[PDB]
Amino acid sequence: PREAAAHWVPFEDKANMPDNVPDVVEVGATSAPLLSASYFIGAKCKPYNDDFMLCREESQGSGAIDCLKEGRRVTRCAVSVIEDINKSCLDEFRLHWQCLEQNNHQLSGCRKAEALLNKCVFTKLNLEKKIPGLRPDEEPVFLKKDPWIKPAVDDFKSVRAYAEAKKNGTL
Amino acid sequence: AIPFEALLPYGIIFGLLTAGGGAMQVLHVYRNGGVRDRFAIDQWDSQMMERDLRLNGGQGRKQVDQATAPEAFKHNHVWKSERPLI
Amino acid sequence: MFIGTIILVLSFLGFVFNRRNIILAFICLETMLLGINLILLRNSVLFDDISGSLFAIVIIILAGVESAIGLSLLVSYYRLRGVINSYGI
Amino acid sequence: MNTFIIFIILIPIVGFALLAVNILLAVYKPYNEKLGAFECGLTSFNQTRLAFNAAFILVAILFLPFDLEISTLLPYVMSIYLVSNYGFTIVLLFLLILIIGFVYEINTNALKINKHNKPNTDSLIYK
Amino acid sequence: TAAGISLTGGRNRCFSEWQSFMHCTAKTDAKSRAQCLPNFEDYMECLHHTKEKARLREIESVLKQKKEGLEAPPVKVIPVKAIGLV
Amino acid sequence: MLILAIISLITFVSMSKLSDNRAIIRLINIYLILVLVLDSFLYLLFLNNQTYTVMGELLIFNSFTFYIDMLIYFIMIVISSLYGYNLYNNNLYKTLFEPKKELIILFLINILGALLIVHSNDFITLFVAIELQSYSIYLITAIYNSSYKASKASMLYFFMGGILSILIAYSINTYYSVLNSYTLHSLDSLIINTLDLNLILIALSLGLLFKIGIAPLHKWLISIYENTPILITIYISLIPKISILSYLVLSNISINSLVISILAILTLLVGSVGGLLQIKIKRLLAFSGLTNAGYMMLLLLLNNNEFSYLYYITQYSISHLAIFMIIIFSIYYINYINNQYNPIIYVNQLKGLIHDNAYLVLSMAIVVFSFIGIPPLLGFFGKLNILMSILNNGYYFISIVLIVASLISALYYLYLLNVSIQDKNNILINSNETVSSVLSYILSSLIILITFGFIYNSLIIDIFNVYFN
Amino acid sequence: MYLTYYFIEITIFLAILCTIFIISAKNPMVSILYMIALFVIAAMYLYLIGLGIFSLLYIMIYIGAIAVLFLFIITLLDINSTELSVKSNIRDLPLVLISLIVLTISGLMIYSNDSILINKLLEAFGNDYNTIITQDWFNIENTTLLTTIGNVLLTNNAFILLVLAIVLLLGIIGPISITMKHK
Amino acid sequence: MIINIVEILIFLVCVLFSVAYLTVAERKTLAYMQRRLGPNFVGYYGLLQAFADAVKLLLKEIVLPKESNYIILVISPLITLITALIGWVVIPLGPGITLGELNLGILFSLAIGSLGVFGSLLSGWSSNSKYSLLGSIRSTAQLISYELILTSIFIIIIMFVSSLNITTIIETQRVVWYCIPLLPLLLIFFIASVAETARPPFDLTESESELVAGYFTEYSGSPFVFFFLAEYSNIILISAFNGYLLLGGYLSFNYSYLFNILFNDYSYVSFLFEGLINSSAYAIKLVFLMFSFIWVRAAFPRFTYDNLINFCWIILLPLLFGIFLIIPSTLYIFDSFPTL
Ligand SMILES: CCCCC/C=C/C/C=C/CCCCCCCC(=O)O[C@H](COC(=O)CCCCCCCCCCCCCCC)COP(=O)([O-])OCC[N+](C)(C)C
Ligand SMILES: CCCCCCCCCCCCCCCCCC(=O)OC[C@H](COP(=O)(O)OCCN)OC(=O)CCCCCCCCCCCCCCCCC
C-alpha cells in the first residue's frame, strides 16, 4: 500500500505451497496482452471474480487462507479466456497489444486494431466488450466517430489491416 | 529583405536543439529495445512493469504472451525489505 | 525520530542561550518548527496516513504567517530605536 | 543510477572547473587603490546606517501571505475532479476571504510611496 | 475528520483493528470495557509492533548461538537488476 | 456572526477616514448587542446536556461552551464601549484614549480565535485557533507602536508565545505518535489505564497553561501587563485566560495531576506574596490575576467542575472589568498625568479619592471586597463553590494553602482602599464637564451585578440543573 | 550496493553539524545562510524517507519565502552582534550539558509505554528489524499524496481551510496596520 | 550506464552551446533593428563571438574589494549558475524525453525558479555599500513580486490538467493549445517572464540605479561569466516554461498521414525522424520566443520602481483574482472537471 523507499532490498524465498493446497496454473500474460484481454476476461469471469471479492469481504481479516479455494477459479477461468483468444485470433490480438506496446499502453491510441479484435472475438469467442455504469443517451467512447483525442502516430500494420478489412467487406 | 546573418545564429540554435532531440529519442528507443518511452507511470503501472520483468525473464519489456506461465515464475516472487527509517 | 528530536533540542538550546543577537533567536524558532515537522512526517509515513501530513501542511502555513507577523513586529521595534541591541530587546 | 542525478552532480563540476581555470590562468597582482568599492570614480564615506521607506519593507513582508495562499491553492488543483460541486464552493469561499483582505490592502494604498513635491497649494492672500 | 484515510485516500494500515475496537466499544457501556482489552492490545501492537519485535529478538538471540545456524529452505537475496534472471 | 462582522468591517474600515474610527466602534458595539438579544434562544438546543459535534468531529458544541461564548460577547460589548465612547469632551482625553484605525479588526479576529478553542474538539482546530489568537495578541500589543514599552512588550510576548506554541505542537504530535487519533474523545477512560498518557497530556496542559501566567513562568506576563497601555491590557489580560482555561476545564486530561497540584500550590504562594511590596497599580492588579488564575488550576485536577468554574468565571470577569474601569475614572482626579498611553501608574496617585467623587470609592470598595471574598458580594460564592469542589474530592492540603493565599492576597487588595480613603489637601468643589452617561451606566450595572447578584444564586442553580444534567 | 544504506544516518549527522554553525557564526547572515542549508538537509531527508512532494514544498515555501524575508530584513536593518567568546558562555556550559542530557533522553522517552523508565528508552533503540513491503493490487488510479491532501483539506476539514483563510487574512492586515502611519 | 552518460553529455553540450549563441543572435538582431550589422569580425559570418568573449573573460583577473566577504562574492555566481542550470532537466524534447522524468515536474520547475532570487540579494551584501545594498533591495523586491504572478499563471494552467507532470500537459494539449483560449494569459505571462529575468523593458538596476552596472558592478572574470551565463539560461528556461504550458510543447500538427505515406514499419530512422519533427516544433516555439524578448528590448524605455510595483500589485494582480474566479467557474458551468 505504501512504496518502498530508503534502500529497500529485494529478497526471494525458495519454498513451496503445502500439500493440502492443490496446484494452480498461473497467468503468463504481460501488461499489453492483459490490458488487451481485460474486457473479455471481465466479461466471461464476472461471477467468479465477484465470488472471490465477496468471500474476501465476508471473512474479514481471514483474507488470504480462507478464500484461497475461490482465487483458484478466477485464475483458471482467465487462463481459459486467454487460451481461447490465442487459438481464435492470435494475429489480431497480437496486432492489438503490439499497438499498445507503444503509446504508453494508452487505449486511446489503438482504435483501429481494437475494432478488428472486438469484431473477431464477438464473431468467434462470442464475448462483447461493454462499459457498465453508462446510462443510455451516453455513447461509449470506443464507438465514437471523430474523437477529439487522436494518437500521435497510427501504427502501420493496423492501418493496413483496417483498410484491408474495409476492402474485404468483413468490417 | 530578410537578413541571413541575423537568422544564422537562430539557425544554429534551431539545429542544435533539433539534433539534440533527435539523438535523445534514438537513445531512448535503443534503451527500451525498439519501442517508445512510458511518459507517465502510475503506482499500478510501476507494479505492473515489475511483474512483467518477472514474467519475461530478465529483459525489460520483452512482452511475452504465453498461455501458462513457467515454473521458475512461481518461485521468483520478491518481497521488498525496507530498512529501519530512524 | 532522531533527526527531528535532535533539531528540536539543539535549536531550542541555541535559542535559550542566545545572547549575541536577535535574528539568531528568530532562526532558532524556525529550525524548531522544522524539527516538529520532521517528527510528524515520519509518523505519517510509518502509520500509512495523510493525517499527520494534514497537520503538517497546516503548520507550514502557520509557520509562514508567524514569520510575516513577527518580522513586522521587529520593524515596529526598530522604528523608534535605530539600532537593535546585541544583548537583546 | 538514473540520468537525473548525473546532472545535479555534473553542473557543479563544470562550474568549479570554470572557476578553477580562472584562478589558475589569470594573474593576481592587486594593490590598495585597485581594491575598494566602485562609485563613479570617486571614493566617499559610507554612512553607517541609512533610512528607508515603509513600502520597501512592506513589499516583502506582504509577499509571504499571498505566496502562502498560492501554495494553498495547489492541493485543490490536483483534486479538482474528486471534489465535484462541493470543494469548488469551499475554494470559492477561501479565495473570497482572501480577496477582501486584498481590497483592504489596495484601499489603504500601502505599497504606494507619496511624493513630497507639493506645488504650493496655498494661494496668495495678502495683508 | 481524517480518522482512517491513508496516503492514497484508502484505509490505513491499522484500520481493520481500529474498526474492530470501535465495534467493541459501540455495543459496550462503561464498567464493562474490561472485556474490550484484547481489541485495544491488538490495535496498539498493530501500530507499534512491540510484541512482534520482542518475539523476533527472542528468536534472534537463539540464531547467533548455533554453529549450524540454518537448516531450512533459505531466503536468497538478489540485486535489483536481477528480478527475473534465471 | 463574527465572520460576517469581520468581512463587512475591514472593507468598511478601508474606506472610512481616520476621524470616523471612533464612530465605527459604536456601530459594532450595537451589533454585538443584537447578537446577544436576538440570538440567545439557541440555549433551547441544549437541554439535558445534549452536545453536538459540527463540521465532522471538529467543533463540539455543548452548553458549557455556549455560556463561555455569551460571556465573551458581553465583555466585548463592554470593552468596545470603552474604546468607542468618549470619557469627557476635553482636549486632553482625545489624545489619551483614542482608537487606531485597525483596532476593532484585531479585536474581532481575536474573539474569533478565542471562540474556536472553547468550541473545539480536534487538535488542529485547537492549534490553528491558538495561533490565530496569539497573532491577535501580538498585534493588539504592537498596534500602539509609538511607545517604547509597548513595542518591547510585543517583542517579548512574541518570543515567549512562540516557545509555548511549539511546546503545544510537540505535545500534539507526541500524542499522535502513540495513537493514530486527534481527539480526546478517543480516550474514553479504558485507554488511560493501560497507556502511559500521563507525560503527554500533562505536557500538553502545561504548554497551554504557561500562556495564562502560571507561576514558574509568570514574570514575563507581569512585564507585558505593566508595559502595555491601560486600554489594551484589560483585553489581553481577560481573553486568553477565559479561552484557554475553559478549553482545559472542558477536557479533563489532568486529574490526579501531581504536577498541576505543585504548580497550583506554587501559583497561590508566589501570587499572594509576589504582589505585596508593589507600588504600580497594573502590577498590583496583575498579581491579582495570577492568584485568581491559580484558583482555576485547582479545578483542572477535578472531575465534574462545571459549576465552580463558570460561576467563578463570570465572577472574575465582572470584578476584573469593574476594577479596571474604576481606575479609568480616577484619572480626572489625579494631580499628575504622565505617560500618555498609561496615564495612572503609581497606586498612591488615587490618594484623595474619597473627598472627590466619594461614590467612586463606594464602587471601588464594593468591587475590592468581592476580590477578597466577603459574603454579601458575588466573589464569595465563587470562592465558596471552589471550596465545595476541592474538599469533596480529596485535596486537603490544597484547601488550607488556598485559604492562606486568600488571606495574604487580601493585604494588597485592601491597600487600594487604604490609599483611597485618605485626606487630601486640595479637594474638587465643582467640575464643568461630567462623565459619559452610557459609559458610567456600565460601571453602575457592573456593581449592581456584584452587590445584588447573590439574589439569583438559587435561580441559576435550578437553571444549571436542567441544561447541564 | 550497500554504500546506499547509511544515507539517513548521514543526514542526521549532517543536520546536527549544521545547527552548530547556526548558533556560532560571527556574521548573522552567514548563520541564516547555514539555516538555508539546514532546510536543504531536511528536504534531503524528506525525499529519502519517501516524501518527494514535501521536499519541493519546503524548498518553495521555507527557502523561497521565509528565508528571503529573513535575508531581506537583515540587509536594510541594524543588528549588533557579539562573537562567541569563551568568557561569556563558559558560564552557560554546565546547564547546557545538563539540559542536553535531560531534554535529549526525555525527548526519546515518549514513544513507548512500559511503566519502567529504563524500558522506555531502550525501545527507542530497538529498530534494526526490516519492515516487509508487500504489493497489493487494490488501487486503480494515481491518487498521489497531494491529491489526498486536496481531498481532506476540502471536504473533511474544509472549516480548517476556512479558519486558515482568516489566519492568512490576519497575516495581511497586521503588518500593514503596524507599518502604515495613516495620515 | 554508457547510454545515460552519453545522453546527458549531448543534452549538456546542446544547451550550453545554445546559451552562448543566444547572446550572439541578440547582438545580431538588435543591430538590424537599429539598421547596422552585428559582429562579423570573429568568425566567417560572426559566429563564435561568444567564445571570444568567454576565452578572454576567463583570462581577466578576479579582484575582491576590501569591504567584501570574498567567499560570498564567489559563491553567489556558483549558486546562481547551478540554479539557472538545474532547471533544464524537466523540459521534454518530445514525449517522455527528459533528463529525469518525475511525476511532479512543475513543482520542481517552480521550486528552482524560487531559488534564483538569492544570488541577487546575497550578492548585495558582498562588498557591503549603502549605495549597493539598497539597489539589491529594489531588485529582490521586484524579482519576488513578479514571481508571485508567475506561480499563479502556472496554477491557472494546471486547473485544466490536474497533473503536475509536464509531458502529461503537452499530451493533454494535443486537442487545442492553451494560448488560444487563454489569450490575455499569454500577454501577462510574457510580461511576467520579461520581469522575472529583469530584462530591460522592466529593468532598473543595470542602468538607473546608483551603480552603473547593476548589482554585479564590481566584478571581473569568472564571477561575471557565471552571471552572464545564468541570465541567458534564465531567458531560455522561462521561454521553455512558456513553450510547454502555454504554447505547444513539441506539437505542430497531426503528421499521421505523412507517416502512412512515407514509412512501413517502426525502425530507428522512423524514431529519428519523429524526434526531429518534435524537437523542431519545440525549438521554433522557443526561438520565436527569444526573438520576442530581444524585440521588446529594442523598442522601449524603462520603469521607475513606483511604476513597477504599482504595475504588479495594483493592476495585474486584481485582474488575476478575477481570472482565479472566472476559470474554475467556467469549468464548473459546463460539466467538465479534469481527471487525474
Ligand atoms: C433576551 C435575552 C437577554 C440577553 C441576556 C444576555 C446575557 C449575557 C450575560 C452573561 C453574563 C452575565 C450573567 C448571566 C447569568 C445567567 C445565568 C444562567 O442562566 O446560566 C446558567 C448557569 O450559569 C452558570 O453556570 C453560572 C453563572 C452564574 C452567574 C453569576 C452572576 C449572577 C448575577 C447576574 C445574574 C442575574 C442578573 C439578573 C438581573 C435581572 C446556564 O446558562 P443558560 O444556557 O441557561 O443561558 C440562559 C439564557 N439566557 C441568558 C437568555 C437567559
Ligand atoms: C469584457 C471582458 C473584459 C475585457 C478586458 C479583458 C481583461 C483581460 C485583458 C488582460 C490583458 C492585460 C495585459 C496587461 C495590461 C497592462 C495594463 C497597462 O497597460 O498598464 C497601464 C499602466 C498605466 O497605469 P495607469 O496609472 O492606470 O495610467 C493612467 C494614466 N493617467 O501603464 C504601464 O504600466 C506601462 C505599460 C507596461 C506594459 C508592459 C509592456 C512590456 C512588454 C509588452 C509585451 C508585448 C508582447 C509582444 C510579444 C510578441 C507579440 C507578437
Cell numbers linked to D121: 497649494
For residue F165, the surrounding DSSP H or E stretch is helix F148-178
Region of H165 on the Ramachandran plot (φ > 0 left; ψ -120 to 50 alpha; else beta): beta
Length of chain G: 183
Cβ F338 vs Cβ F348: under 8 Å = no
Q: What is the dihedral of CA D63, D69, D75, D81, to 10 degrees?
A: -130
Contacts of F160 by beta carbon, 8 Å cutoff, 6+ apart: F217, F220
CB contact (8 A) between residue H279 and residue B20: yes
Chain centroid offset of residue F198 CA = 29
CATH number (domain holding residue D56)? 1.20.58.1610
Establish whether residue H317 lines the binding site of ligand 2, counting it when its CB lies within 6 angstroms of any ligand atom.
no
The contacts found for B23-26 with CB under 8 angstroms, 24 or more apart, are B23/H7, B23/H10, B23/H275, B24/H7, B24/H10, B24/H11, B24/H93, B24/H94, B24/H97, B24/H275, B24/H279, B25/H93, B25/H94, B25/H97, B25/H271, B25/H272, B25/H274, B25/H275, B25/H278, B25/H279, B26/H268, B26/H271, B26/H272, B26/H275
Residue F367 burial (CB count, 10 A): 28
What is the pairing mode between strands G131-133 and B78-82? antiparallel
Q: In whole angstroms, what is the distance from residue F285 CA to residue F299 CA?
A: 23
Nearest to F453 by CA among F381, F384, F362: F381
DSSP one-letter string for A112-129: HHHHHHHHHHHHHT----
DSSP state of B72: S
CB atoms inside a 10 Å sphere around CB B72: 12
Q: Which residues pair with E75 in a beta bridge?
A: A13
Q: Residue G124 is placed in which grid cell?
A: 527507542
Residue type present at position G17:
L
- Separation between Cα atoms, residue C56 and residue C48, nearest integer Å: 15
D16: in domain = yes
Which of the residues C36, C51, C57, C59 would you substitute to probe the G interface, choosing the one with the greatest number of G C-beta atoms within 10 Å?
Answer: C57
CA distance to A8, G7, H254, per residue, from G4 (Å): 10, 6, 46
- Residue H246 Cα, ligand 2 centroid: separation in angstroms? 19
Chain-centre distance for alpha carbon C6: 14
CB proximity F356 to E under 8 Å: no
Nearest to H17 by CA among D17, D25, B14, B28: B14
The whole domain housing E67 covers 1-86
C1 in F contact zone (CB under 8 Å): yes
The backbone torsions φ and ψ at residue B78, rounded to the nearest 5 degrees and listed phi first, read -115, 140
Q: Are H226 and H286 in contact (CB under 8 A)?
A: no
User: Per-residue DSSP letters for E29-67?
Assistant: -TT-GGGGHHHHHHHHHHHH-HHHHHHHHHHHHHHTT-S
Question: If you take atom 23 of ligand 2, which residue's CA is the nearest one?
Answer: H311
Are the C-beta atoms of residues G134 and B77 closer than 8 Å to each other? no
What is the whole-number distance in angstroms between the Cα of residue F41 and the centre of ligand 1?
12
CB atoms within 10 A of CB H338: 16
Query: Is the minimum CB–CB distance between A149 and chain H shorter than 8 Å?
Result: yes
Structural contact between residues H42 and B48, judged by C-beta atoms closer than 8 angstroms:
no
Give contacts of A2 with chain C, Cβ < 8 Å. 45, 48
Distance of CA F225 to the CA centre of its chain: 12
Q: Extract the runs of DSSP E, i.e. beta strands, from G14-153.
A: 131-133
Cβ < 6 A, ligand 1 pocket: F 36-37, 40, 43, 63, 66-67, 70-71, 74, 310-311, 314, 449, 453, 456, 460, 463-464, 467
Nearest to C47 by CA among G4, F173, G106: F173
In order of G84, H125, H136, H210, H219, the CA distances from H207 in angstroms are 42, 20, 13, 9, 16
Interchain proximity F181–E30, CB inside 8 Å? no
Note whether F58 contacts E37, CB cutoff 8 Å.
no
As separate numbers, helices (DSSP H) first and strands (DSSP E) second, chain E gives: 3, 1
CB contact under 8 A, C37 and G178: no
CA distances from F231 to D103, F76, F83 (A): 29, 13, 8
- Asked if residues F279 and F367 have their Cβ atoms less than 8 Å apart, the reply is no
Do the Cβ atoms of F401 and F323 come closer than 8 Å?
no
CB contacts of C50 in chain E (<8 Å) are: 2, 5-7, 9
Q: Hunting for cell 546562481 — which residue is that?
A: H80
F57 phi, psi to nearest 5 deg: 65, 35
| Among the listed residues H60, H74, H61, H224, the one whose alpha carbon sits nearest the alpha carbon of residue D28 | H61
Can you list the positions of beta strands (E) in F223-366? Answer: none
Q: Would you call F464 exposed, middle or buried from its count of C-beta atoms within 10 A (0-12, 13-18, 19+)?
A: middle
User: 3-state DSSP call for residue F55?
Assistant: coil
Task: Please report how the helices F306-329 and F437-451 are oriented relative to each other, as an axis angle in degrees rounded to 10.
Answer: 140
Burial class (CB in 10 A: 0-12, 13-18, 19+), H239: buried
Resolution of the experimentally solved model in angstroms: 3.2
CA distance linking residue E75 with residue B81, whole number of Å? 12
CB F61 within 8 A of CB F51: yes
Task: Measure the CA–CA gap between G170 and D98, rounded to whole angstroms.
Answer: 10
Q: Is D115 inside any structural domain?
A: no
Cα of F316 from ligand 1 centre, angstroms: 15
Contact: C55, F124; criterion CB under 8 Å? yes
Q: Give the chain A residue nearest C46 (alpha carbons).
A: A2
**Residues from chain C contacting residue G19 (CB–CB below 8 Å):** 7, 10-11, 14, 31
**CA pair distance D14, D20, nearest whole angstrom:** 10
To the nearest whole Å, the CA of B54 is away from the closest chain E CA by 5
Pairing state between β A9-13 and E75-77? antiparallel
Confirm if G60 and C57 have CB atoms less than 8 A apart. no
G178, G181, G183: best to mutate for the F interface, most F CBs within 10 A: G178
Task: Give the count of domains, chain E.
Answer: 1
Domains of chain D: total: 1
Q: Which residues of D70-106 are buried (b: 16+ CB within 10 A; e: fewer)?
A: bbbbbbbbbbbebbeeebbebbeebbebbbbbbbbbe
Residues of F in contact with G110 (CB under 8 A): 174, 177-178, 199-200
Which chains lie within 8 Å of chain F at 3 or more CB pairs, if any?
Answer: C, D, E, G
Domain ranges (residues) in chain B: 1-86
- For A92-122, b/e burial (b = at least 16 CB within 10 A) is bbbbbbbbbbbbbbbbebbbbbbbbbbebbe
3-state secondary structure (DSSP) of residue H337: coil
Phi, psi of H213 (to 5 degrees): -135, 35
C-alpha cell at A75: 485464475
Give dist(CA G167, CA H167) in Å, integer. Answer: 37
Q: Output the CA–CA distances (angstroms, integers) from residue A28 to A13, A80, A127, G71, H21, in the order listed.
A: 20, 12, 22, 60, 54
Query: In the 8-state DSSP scheme, what is residue A108?
Result: G
Alpha carbons E84 and A30: distance in angstroms, whole number? 14
Contact G173, D46 (CB under 8 A): no
Question: Does the Cβ of H292 fall within 6 Å of ligand 2?
Answer: yes
Residue F111 CB neighbours (<10 A): 25
Chain E positions touching B72 (Cβ under 8 A) are 86
- The vertex-F62 CA angle with F40 and G161, nearest 5°, equals 95
Helix (H, G, I), strand (E, B) or coil at E76: strand
Q: For residue C56, which of C75, C43, C69 has the smallest C-alpha distance?
A: C43
Which ligand sits nearest to residue H242's alpha carbon? 2
From ligand 1's centre to the CA of F38, what distance in Å? 15
Cα separation, F277 vs G54, whole angstroms: 55
**How crowded is residue F198: how many other Cβ atoms within 10 Å of its Cβ?**
16
Breaks (C-N over 2.5 A) in chain E follow: none
Among candidate residues H190, H304, H237, H307, the one with its CA nearest the CA of residue H91: H237
Quote the longest CA-to-CA distance of chain H: 70
Residue G92 CA, distance from chain mean position? 26
Residue F383: CB partners within 8 Å, gap ≥ 6? F295, F312, F373, F406
Restricting to C residues 49-78, those with a Cβ less than 8 Å away from any Cβ of E are 49-51, 53-54
Interface test with chain G among F19, F135, F136, F183, by most G beta carbons within 10 Å: F135
Residue G94 and residue G92: Cα distance in Å, rounded?
A: 6
Instruction: Return d(Cα H168, Cα D18) in angstroms, integer.
Output: 37
Q: Which amino acid is at H199?
A: R
DSSP secondary structure string, F305-326?
Answer: -HHHHHHHHHHHHHHHHHHHHH
Assess contact for F2 and F94: CB atoms under 8 A. Answer: no
Closest residue of A to H278, CA-based?
Answer: A152
Contacts of H274 in chain B (CB under 8 A): 25
| Residue A54 to residue A31: CA distance in whole angstroms | 26
Residue-range definition of the domain harbouring residue D95: 3-28+32-108
Please tell me if residue E1 touches chain F, with a CB cutoff of 8 Å.
Answer: yes
Residue of G nearest to B50 (CA): G135
Contact B53 E86 (CB under 8 A): no
Give the whole-angstrom CA distance, residue G108 versus residue B86: 12
Are A7 and G5 contacting, i.e. CB atoms less than 8 angstroms apart?
A: yes
d(CA G124, CA G105) in angstroms, rounded, equals: 10
Q: C-alpha F78: how far from its chain's center? A: 13
- Closest residue in B to C3 (Cα) is B86
Residues of E in contact with G129 (CB under 8 A): 53, 56
> Helix (H, G, I), strand (E, B), or coil: what is residue B75?
coil
Assigned C-alpha cell, F39: 440570538
C with D: how many residue pairs have Cβ under 8 Å apart? 22
Q: Does the beta carbon of H188 lie inside 6 Å of ligand 2?
A: yes
Nearest-Cα distance to chain D for H298, in Å, is 27
Distance from CA of B55 to the nearest CA of H (A): 24
Record: contact C43-F128, CB cut-off 8 A:
no
For H206, phi then psi, to 5°, come to -65, -30
Name every chain E residue with its beta carbon within 8 A of the beta carbon of C44: 7
Does G52 sit within 8 Å of H111, measured CB to CB? no
Cα within 13 Å of Cα(A12), Cβ side: 18
What number of CA atoms fall less than 13 Å from residue F60's CA on the CB side? 21
Do you know the residue count of chain H?
340
Cα gap G146→G151, rounded to integer Å: 9
| DSSP states along chain D | --TTHHHHHHHHHHHHHHHHHHHHHS-----TTTSS--STT---PPPS-----HHHHHHHHHHHHHHHHHTTSHHHHHSTTTS-SSHHHHHHHHHHHHHHHHHHHHHHT-SPPP-------S-----
Nearest to G169 among D64, D79, D98 (CB): D98
* Distance, CA of G113 to CA of G107 (rounded, Å): 14
